[PDB]
Amino acid sequence: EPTCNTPSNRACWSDGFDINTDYEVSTPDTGVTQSYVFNLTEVDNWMGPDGVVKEKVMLINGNIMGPNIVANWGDTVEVTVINNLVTNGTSIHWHGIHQKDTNLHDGANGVTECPIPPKGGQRTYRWRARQYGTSWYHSHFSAQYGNGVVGTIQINGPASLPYDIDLGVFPITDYYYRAADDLVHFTQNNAPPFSDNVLINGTAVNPNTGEGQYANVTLTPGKRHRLRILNTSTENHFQVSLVNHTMTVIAADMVPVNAMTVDSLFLAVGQRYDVVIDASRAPDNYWFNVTFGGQAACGGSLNPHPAAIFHYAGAPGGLPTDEGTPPVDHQCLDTLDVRPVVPRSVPVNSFVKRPDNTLPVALDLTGTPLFVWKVNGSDINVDWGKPIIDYILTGNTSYPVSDNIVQVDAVDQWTYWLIENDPEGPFSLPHPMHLHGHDFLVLGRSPDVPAASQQRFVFDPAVDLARLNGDNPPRRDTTMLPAGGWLLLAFRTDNPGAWLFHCHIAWHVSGGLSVDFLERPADLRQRISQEDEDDFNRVCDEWRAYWPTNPYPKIDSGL
Amino acid sequence: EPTCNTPSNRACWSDGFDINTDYEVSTPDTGVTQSYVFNLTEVDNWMGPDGVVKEKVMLINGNIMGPNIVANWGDTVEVTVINNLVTNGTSIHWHGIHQKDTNLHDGANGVTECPIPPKGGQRTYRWRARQYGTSWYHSHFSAQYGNGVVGTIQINGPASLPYDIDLGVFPITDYYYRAADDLVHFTQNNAPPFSDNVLINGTAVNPNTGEGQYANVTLTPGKRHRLRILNTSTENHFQVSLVNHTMTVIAADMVPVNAMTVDSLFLAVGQRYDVVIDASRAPDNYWFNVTFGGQAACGGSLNPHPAAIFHYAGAPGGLPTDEGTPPVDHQCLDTLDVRPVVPRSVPVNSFVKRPDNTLPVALDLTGTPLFVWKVNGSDINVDWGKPIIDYILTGNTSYPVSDNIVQVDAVDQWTYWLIENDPEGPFSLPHPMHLHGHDFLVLGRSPDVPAASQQRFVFDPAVDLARLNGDNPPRRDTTMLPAGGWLLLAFRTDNPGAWLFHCHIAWHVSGGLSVDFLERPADLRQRISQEDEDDFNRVCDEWRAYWPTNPYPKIDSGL
Numbered sequence A, B: 001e002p003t004c005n006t007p008s009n010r011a012c013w014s015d016g017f018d019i020n021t022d023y024e025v026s027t028p029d030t031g032v033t034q035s036y037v038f039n040l041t042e043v044d045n046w047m048g049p050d051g052v053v054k055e056k057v058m059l060i061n062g063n064i065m066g067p068n069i070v071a072n073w074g075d076t077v078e079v080t081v082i083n084n085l086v087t088n089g090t091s092i093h094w095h096g097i098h099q100k101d102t103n104l105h106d107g108a109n110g111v112t113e114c115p116i117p118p119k120g121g122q123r124t125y126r127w128r129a130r131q132y133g134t135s136w137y138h139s140h141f142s143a144q145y146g147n148g149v150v151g152t153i154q155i156n157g158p159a160s161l162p163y164d165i166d167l168g169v170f171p172i173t174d175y176y177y178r179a180a181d182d183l184v185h186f187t188q189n190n191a192p193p194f195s196d197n198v199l200i201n202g203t204a205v206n207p208n209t210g211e212g213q214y215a216n217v218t219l220t221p222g223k224r225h226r227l228r229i230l231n232t233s234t235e236n237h238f239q240v241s242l243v244n245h246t247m248t249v250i251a252a253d254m255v256p257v258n259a260m261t262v263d264s265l266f267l268a269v270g271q272r273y274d275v276v277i278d279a280s281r282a283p284d285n286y287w288f289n290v291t292f293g294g295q296a297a298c299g300g301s302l303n304p305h306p307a308a309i310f311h312y313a314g315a316p317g318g319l320p321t322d323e324g325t326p327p328v329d330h331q332c333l334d335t336l337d338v339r340p341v342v343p344r345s346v347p348v349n350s351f352v353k354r355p356d357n358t359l360p361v362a363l364d365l366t367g368t369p370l371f372v373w374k375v376n377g378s379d380i381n382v383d384w385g386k387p388i389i390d391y392i393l394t395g396n397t398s399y400p401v402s403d404n405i406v407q408v409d410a411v412d413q414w415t416y417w418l419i420e421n422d423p424e425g426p427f428s429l430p431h432p433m434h435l436h437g438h439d440f441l442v443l444g445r446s447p448d449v450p451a452a453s454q455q456r457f458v459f460d461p462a463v464d465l466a467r468l469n470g471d472n473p474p475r476r477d478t479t480m481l482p483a484g485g486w487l488l489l490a491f492r493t494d495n496p497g498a499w500l501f502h503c504h505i506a507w508h509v510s511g512g513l514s515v516d517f518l519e520r521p522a523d524l525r526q527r528i529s530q531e532d533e534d535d536f537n538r539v540c541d542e543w544r545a546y547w548p549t550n551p552y553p554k555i556d557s558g559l
């Protein structure tokens, strides 16, 4: 609970805690728990928000999205998940939530847990809210989140600008009429489809029939409004803009940044931006437009103009009349101009590229099926029935090759990772890379070029070392690997655990595009509570009993 | 020579000849021949128009393009080509010129002729100008035209709109620093590059250094100007627009059409439009913009804003100040709205899909190299040393499989062709399909959707018969095969000969994307003159003597 957080002083939170606190090492002791139940059900012939009826969806508490999780900085969030699906296991991942010393609550099935079995299986997740901002949660059972197992998280806390009104969460997502497993199967041997529509805060209008509704945000004139934008898609990467207005960024993913005003923003899959919008224009109805850049390299939609309505309180109703002008083409790249309020500093002059710090991503067209993604020569394939945590708890170091384990033994040290985007393959795509358990620093990437250009770069020390930034670089949980190029990341090994690092395009991670950082495994085993161990074993026993009875095979990586 | 073609009556030509004459069956007997010599040379370290030096080019008469051929309707055009290259053969194709009963002057090496040998080989082409309009010529020796063996043709004649000034030819082309054989090799195993620049009437500014010059077209205030726009690219498909001005289309390819006013136009590779621009606006400098649509499915350039300057005479110099608005995205599709002045009508209700009228295009990824294009199961591969005409002249009917012979014995009948774009393959691309020896009627295509959306269509007669048009449809020599769809064409078998029908993207035809329509072969042999037969045998004899001495292999289809 805050004691000095006001519109004119959003920097302030409580005694000892403000915007400048190092929230990665200091957390309020509130002693409060916010708890929730997620009852997952399987619904056939479900009428969606654009008038179209979908074959099958998978819903939490019967709605298009799960509960909006809301708690304060330092609270505990607790969620009992009850799996009432017909065949699928399930696992809920808290995306953005670092799970400091609570790896077994990460929700990564095959890594930190077995799937919760269907027909009534249950598990209670429990995690400390040690970071304030906007995050989201979703199934990690193959591509199940594409069926509806998805929701948002708002952990209140201080901010880097003053503002009057918190408008709350604003999820934007691709929307397909075809069910997730059908799309996985299709994307194994075909290039991915455009989306059927793009939902903004759960609604859109049908581009063909005119059924459905525009999302409608009411602005209070003369007021500063915080809007928490999310990209909860399975594949589409979005550019957003508000006709006749600017947006001032105050956080990126779950990291507060210094105020940065822009005309439009790129959101990769899984990215978030908290913005402040001043209602200082003529009182009217204004379009909020979703657009695509990068020449379809990171998605498109069969709805030519997805949009919502920003309405000035006290103005006429009806539709905006100004279509406005197209935003700048972001070429499927997030901005590296953001600067966190709480700084970090690392050296970059000393980096040397070596097999043990290099992650080559490659598309393999030679095997079955056609599209298999490999990192360091291997497509990930987890075993839902023998998670990496099982090996840790039984002292088994014989990890299978397909688990893509990258063991990182350094204790609380900065580690450096060069990810290479198939520079020598016939074709290369942008990928939204996401790290569990940590925010990373984005130290540099290959020069910014048009996404579909097929321009290729290999890291050259004689030109690229000088292009890296170790002085308070963008710090967050998801960033873009450039088509045909490279990305250099760093994170500190402060959190023992098995942590996935993976492309967040569902079809890609389904296709193998992941590794698993095994951070400080010796330290990890010592830190697992008897409570966490017993319950991990309980779920695994139930999953292992269930699986032989399942009528469908596993046909992808499991993630 | 005309007698009644003036600015207010452009419809008039001479006694018996006007815009409504059927130029396909009636031609002025002028008795005049216009002759040219084309001297081909190989130039290394050539300084091109944007300031960059190219490794190697191949030039006609030492310039970036060959001579502008110009003659009157009914004239004879005669060109002596002297091949002074070091190693390559050559053969010049007159694109848009139907070669009525002159198949052996078509310039299709491996089909109508052996290539002209280097180190001084020569051949004289002679053909009748039985069509008036704007066409072009280029080498057909693999992708050699990508090195500079290219130029324009203007055959003067009547028009469908009055105009005051003929501005003449305005060729727009992609421009690569790499040589054609290097691009062919590259494209065999890799997605194709964006162009380095886009030249407009032989010039452009380097977007990095600012070296070079904009094309500068001077307009006469208050006058109507005919502009003859061509796309002479190897891969790039262009949208063109002129800030604050419309363009009135008066011909498409070499076929006069009823006036059609538009804001912007799409030109496929090989396509031409004659347009009339009225200098009716305020005197100033206006940008003529080249842009890309279809989300890169049909090209892009690394020059972000290729452009020319249209200057009103007596206005200030310098650069245009108004950037304008982007045109509508043409999604890599030419317009089907144009209507020829001289009409054709064919039945569409009787069309039945069968194997013998269907041409399935497919990318085969299983062989070597990676990107191989097949039509009806086979990638074309011609024998420069034994052209199809050789089989004809010796009465040998055992045509190799690789020659992709589609024999068509019908005498002067409409024939229907359904072209299918790999609807079952993992991804599909738009293709600019070009027919030698005829203009075709465009009877229909799959529904217009976004070029990069990977939506797929298979001809369904219950839905698609109704979408066909045989009431004076578009008639021309090049049109777009939609990404993932289909195209229905028709031509009348009025021209005995061996006629290529191919994608005009150099990299694809290199890769196998062609067939060879062997039209009425019995009639073909009787109409070949003793001079044509003798000279064919002369050039083949010299080519066959030369080839064993070539230090380089043929690495592609020959086309």
Ligand SMILES: *[C@@H]1O[C@H](CO)[C@@H](O[C@@H]2O[C@H](CO)[C@@H](O[C@@H]3O[C@H](CO[C@H]4O[C@H](CO)[C@@H](O)[C@H](O)[C@@H]4O)[C@@H](O)[C@H](O)[C@@H]3O)[C@H](O)[C@H]2NC(C)=O)[C@H](O)[C@H]1NC(C)=O
Binding pocket: A055, A056, A087, A088, A089, A179, A180, A181, A182, A550, A552, A553, A554, A555
């Ligand atoms: C989790 O639960 C999911 C929901 O039941 C499971 O997905 C189902 O998985 C099976 C087996 O992979 C699929 O069954 C196949 O369906 C395909 C394709 O059907 C498509 O096309 C037909 C028309 O031909 C149309 O009827 C459908 O709408 C589809 O678009 C068949 O060709 C196969 O032979 C086979 O029957 C189901 O389609 C699929 N359902 C959905 C809605 O995705 C999934 O397996 C479960 N996962 C686990 C690990 O338990």
Ligand SMILES: *[C@@H]1O[C@H](CO)[C@@H](O[C@@H]2O[C@H](CO)[C@@H](O[C@@H]3O[C@H](CO[C@H]4O[C@H](CO)[C@@H](O)[C@H](O)[C@@H]4O)[C@@H](O)[C@H](O)[C@@H]3O)[C@H](O)[C@H]2NC(C)=O)[C@H](O)[C@H]1NC(C)=O
Binding pocket: B055, B056, B087, B088, B089, B179, B180, B181, B182, B550, B552, B553, B554, B555
């Ligand atoms: C028609 O004439 C053309 C011009 O002479 C011929 O093209 C040449 O063909 C040869 C034989 O294949 C090529 O030689 C190969 O070159 C490649 C690539 O070298 C280039 O690129 C690399 C790297 O980007 C660069 O380092 C070089 O400096 C080159 O620019 C090499 O890998 C091989 O070692 C081999 O030498 C020529 O490069 C190619 N030249 C050009 C300018 O296109 C063509 O073969 C002739 N065709 C016929 C049928 O006679």
Ligand SMILES: *[C@@H]1O[C@H](CO)[C@@H](O[C@@H]2O[C@H](CO)[C@@H](O[C@@H]3O[C@H](CO)[C@@H](O)[C@H](O)[C@@H]3O)[C@H](O)[C@H]2NC(C)=O)[C@H](O)[C@H]1NC(C)=O
Binding pocket: A287, A288, A289, A290, A291, A305, A306, A307, A319, A323, A324, A325, A326, A327
């Ligand atoms: C922001 O979103 C809005 C709403 O989706 C977009 O407005 C839409 O703009 C398009 C493009 O101009 C309009 O479609 C066109 O309309 C004309 C006239 O009917 C027609 O000739 C074209 O064929 C085309 O269909 C559309 O009416 C309009 N929608 C509404 C409800 O007003 C807007 O373009 C988006 N802005 C940006 C910058 O992305």
Ligand SMILES: *[C@@H]1O[C@H](CO)[C@@H](O[C@@H]2O[C@H](CO)[C@@H](O[C@@H]3O[C@H](CO)[C@@H](O)[C@H](O)[C@@H]3O)[C@H](O)[C@H]2NC(C)=O)[C@H](O)[C@H]1NC(C)=O
Binding pocket: B287, B288, B289, B290, B291, B305, B306, B307, B319, B320, B323, B324, B325, B326, B327
């Ligand atoms: C038609 O072609 C002209 C000429 O290429 C285009 O004009 C150019 O427009 C671009 C985009 O606005 C300008 O680039 C911008 O420059 C400013 C600095 O002044 C900078 O803020 C941006 O980062 C961007 O690079 C460019 O200056 C301008 N060129 C000239 C010589 O005026 C025009 O955009 C094209 N119009 C259409 C409809 O395609």
Ligand SMILES: *[C@@H]1O[C@H](CO)[C@@H](O[C@@H]2O[C@H](CO)[C@@H](O)[C@H](O)[C@H]2NC(C)=O)[C@H](O)[C@H]1NC(C)=O
Binding pocket: A216, A217, A218, A309, A311, A312, A313, A314, A315, A316, A317, A318, A319
């Ligand atoms: C967006 O929501 C607002 C708020 O509910 C709607 O605004 C009202 O519009 C009606 C007429 O349609 C007026 O009579 C009210 O005075 C408005 N309220 C306020 C507070 O300004 C608006 O209609 C909605 N827009 C759409 C497209 O439905």
Ligand SMILES: *[C@@H]1O[C@H](CO)[C@@H](O[C@@H]2O[C@H](CO)[C@@H](O)[C@H](O)[C@H]2NC(C)=O)[C@H](O)[C@H]1NC(C)=O
Binding pocket: A355, A356, A357, A358, A359, A376, A405, A406
């Ligand atoms: C990527 O795979 C390569 C090949 O297995 C790994 O390279 C080895 O790294 C270990 C640890 O440094 C060394 O002992 C070996 O000498 C390396 N083998 C070879 C032949 O290079 C590499 O470590 C893997 N990288 C990552 C990030 O997981």
Ligand SMILES: *[C@@H]1O[C@H](CO)[C@@H](O[C@@H]2O[C@H](CO)[C@@H](O)[C@H](O)[C@H]2NC(C)=O)[C@H](O)[C@H]1NC(C)=O
Binding pocket: B167, B168, B169, B170, B201, B202, B216, B217, B218
């Ligand atoms: C295309 O560019 C050529 C550049 O040569 C232009 O042709 C010249 O233009 C001037 C002025 O109109 C003529 O008087 C010269 O005699 C021409 N030279 C040659 C060799 O043809 C031409 O004008 C350009 N076309 C347009 C529309 O600007």
Ligand SMILES: *[C@@H]1O[C@H](CO)[C@@H](O[C@@H]2O[C@H](CO)[C@@H](O)[C@H](O)[C@H]2NC(C)=O)[C@H](O)[C@H]1NC(C)=O
Binding pocket: B214, B216, B217, B218, B309, B311, B312, B313, B314, B315, B316, B317, B318, B319
């Ligand atoms: C395009 O060409 C025209 C020539 O037709 C140039 O227009 C002249 O501009 C100069 C000033 O630079 C004037 O003194 C002349 O009087 C103009 N002549 C006419 C006939 O209008 C124009 O400068 C050229 N544009 C560019 C970019 O070079």
Ligand SMILES: *[C@@H]1O[C@H](CO)[C@@H](O[C@@H]2O[C@H](CO)[C@@H](O)[C@H](O)[C@H]2NC(C)=O)[C@H](O)[C@H]1NC(C)=O
Binding pocket: B355, B356, B357, B358, B359, B376, B406
């Ligand atoms: C494409 O290839 C197939 C051969 O697989 C051709 O189909 C044959 O055509 C003849 C008629 O000319 C029929 O008698 C045979 O029954 C067909 N065979 C099959 C398997 O259907 C087809 O003609 C070819 N099409 C074109 C336009 O070349």
Ligand SMILES: *[C@@H]1O[C@H](CO)[C@@H](O)[C@H](O)[C@H]1NC(C)=O
Binding pocket: A039, A040, A041, A062, A082, A084
């Ligand atoms: C889950 O939701 C369904 C659908 O409303 C309901 O019938 C069921 O009893 C719920 N189960 C539990 C244990 O929450």
Ligand SMILES: *[C@@H]1O[C@H](CO)[C@@H](O)[C@H](O)[C@H]1NC(C)=O
Binding pocket: A167, A168, A169, A170, A201, A215, A216, A217, A218
């Ligand atoms: C999002 O939609 C919900 C309805 O579920 C509404 O309560 C909320 O105000 C919306 N938020 C915005 C910013 O429009």
Ligand SMILES: *[C@@H]1O[C@H](CO)[C@@H](O)[C@H](O)[C@H]1NC(C)=O
Binding pocket: A386, A394, A395, A396, A397, A398
């Ligand atoms: C490691 O795990 C595998 C799979 O369960 C098992 O076969 C092997 O016996 C285990 N080894 C140890 C040391 O427990």
Ligand SMILES: *[C@@H]1O[C@H](CO)[C@@H](O)[C@H](O)[C@H]1NC(C)=O
Binding pocket: B039, B040, B041, B062, B082, B084
């Ligand atoms: C062609 O051009 C070259 C160089 O310009 C010249 O040496 C040669 O004599 C010319 N050859 C002929 C036959 O025209």
Ligand SMILES: *[C@@H]1O[C@H](CO)[C@@H](O)[C@H](O)[C@H]1NC(C)=O
Binding pocket: B386, B394, B396, B397, B398, B400
């Ligand atoms: C007919 O052509 C084929 C293909 O070149 C050839 O192998 C065969 O020898 C020819 N036969 C005659 C009689 O020339």
Ligand SMILES: COc1cccc(OC)c1O
Binding pocket: A190, A191, A192, A296, A297, A298, A299, A371, A429, A507
């Ligand atoms: C834009 O997205 C894509 C385009 C082409 C191929 C892909 O994966 C095989 C893919 O994911």
Ligand SMILES: COc1cccc(OC)c1O
Binding pocket: B190, B191, B192, B296, B297, B298, B299, B363, B371, B429, B507
């Ligand atoms: C958009 O252009 C292309 C992309 C990928 C492969 C191609 O050749 C097979 C190609 O021509």
